[model samples]
Target chain A: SNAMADLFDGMKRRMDALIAERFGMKVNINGTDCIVVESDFLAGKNVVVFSGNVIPRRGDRVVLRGSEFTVTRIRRFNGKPQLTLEEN
Target chain B: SNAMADLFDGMKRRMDALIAERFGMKVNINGTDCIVVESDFLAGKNVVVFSGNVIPRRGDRVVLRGSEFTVTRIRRFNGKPQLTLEEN
Candidate 1:
């Protein structure tokens, strides 16, 4: 059981890294619904947000590279950023 | 007055053509909130949708090339297609 879990964890890490590399950003999930990200350049700009099947709740951490941000709001409008956050 | 209207119409046609070439799709606004499009390849798959400052209502006409599609549903989920329709 532990081996299976560890194998999945490694795959997950690789997938996260690939996403970051391709999108030029990093994201980390916190608790259950929070996502933390680290990015200095995205500090005030809106992102093209997409929360596949799970929407991010408020207070989620979004990590962009090494920068950190906290989720503040989620907009319902189309073509708008899915997650809104402030520098943390 | 008619000349001014004609000029706007010409501009609109050019813009529509440009969008069609760039995105490989065609869109037509039939009513206040309805939008129709024509695409041969998108018959059954979803699209990346974006509406700015306006949302398509039902019964709108969306034309693609010479083909047309009617707006049937607008989902409220993120990264999902903005419009759905049956082939027409």
Candidate 2:
């Protein structure tokens, strides 16, 4: 039983790491302080792409380029960030 | 047809103003330079809210509080911004 739990834990960690690596960020959802970036050290350099999952709350703090942004609303779309703008 | 077009244009202006006033902003979606805010002069005062239609494509410049942000990704959610943060 212990071994199984440990195995699962390891797998979970690995998965998390992979996701973080691929996504290049780790987000934390806390109250309105949700949405933290665990990667992209130079988020200010180029256009920062967000996933549909990057929803932020009214007061959520989004850290980009070492600066913090309080989210005030939700933006919806059915395509990639680039494509969403073209729909209009 | 000319009269109808004039009437439609007047209606469009009124509607645009109303939306901008209520939403507190006007966004311009260009080729890749979309997402411009024409309201919320104090966009930096609090958290700037975005709507489902606030999708910005790659390289799009999002002007807020006189500052510009290039969007890189899209985040999806089925609820209000506040609710979205709590879902996680």
- lDDT per prediction? 0.46, 0.34
Per-candidate interface C-alpha RMSD?
Answer: 19.6, 23.2
DockQ of candidate model 2: 0.01
For model 1, residues A1-88, the per-residue Cα lDDT tens digits are 3343344335444543343344443355453332322223223534434334345668877665566778787754223345677788
TM-scores for all predictions: 0.38, 0.22
- Over A6-34, each residue of candidate 2 has an lDDT whose tens digit, in order, gives 44335434533343344443333322222
**Positional deviation of residue B16's Cα in model 1 after best superposition, in angstroms:** 10
Which numbered prediction scores highest in lDDT against the true structure?
1
